[PDB]
Amino acid sequence: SFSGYLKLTDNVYIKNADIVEEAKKVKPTVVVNAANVYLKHGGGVAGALNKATNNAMQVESDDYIATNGPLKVGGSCVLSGHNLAKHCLHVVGPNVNKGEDIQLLKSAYENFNQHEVLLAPLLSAGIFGADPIHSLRVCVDTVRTNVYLAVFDKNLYDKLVSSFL
């Protein structure tokens, strides 16, 4: 199971790790993807998770979008976890670089409450443009289920832990 995590709260854990490497090691029930409404896994966590599945996640996502249309910002969908997890919960946090409403970050994290345990990135952080310190704050104030956060960037991991209230 999950190892080397620092406990932030009763249910939120954090580790400086590559989420793809964590997923291959643990093979959790749910790995969260930092998705966009079109499930186009181009960069950041999405591009990295997709590449680890040999593009199977993108082929599956294209079929999902053809059948159901795009997701909403703040929404999610459960698809296969392929070689990384039992399932992948594709969650759409607001992308500030696309002018999306940062207020939707709480709705995005609420999707985690439908799963007892998850391996996840900080939503809307990285290329999504939001402040990761604010994303961690929304995470601990919204998620009630067991969330194991993987933070790729070492300097950011240290800043998140050191500034955690």
UniProtKB/Swiss-Prot annotation:
It is a multi-pass membrane protein. It comes from Severe acute respiratory syndrome coronavirus 2. May form homohexamers. Interacts with N protein. This is Papain-like protease nsp3. It comes from the Viruses. Residues 1-165 form the Macro domain. It is found in: Host endoplasmic reticulum membrane. Changing residue 29 to A: In strain: Mu/B.1.621. Responsible for the cleavages located at the N-terminus of the replicase polyprotein. Participates together with nsp4 in the assembly of virally-induced cytoplasmic double-membrane vesicles necessary for viral replication. Antagonizes innate immune induction of type I interferon by blocking the phosphorylation, dimerization and subsequent nuclear translocation of host IRF3. Also prevents host NF-kappa-B signaling. In addition, PL-PRO possesses a deubiquitinating/deISGylating activity and processes both 'Lys-48'- and 'Lys-63'-linked polyubiquitin chains from cellular substrates. Inhibited in vitro by GRL-0617. Signal peptide: none annotated. It catalyses: Thiol-dependent hydrolysis of ester, thioester, amide, peptide and isopeptide bonds formed by the C-terminal Gly of ubiquitin (a 76-residue protein attached to proteins as an intracellular targeting signal).
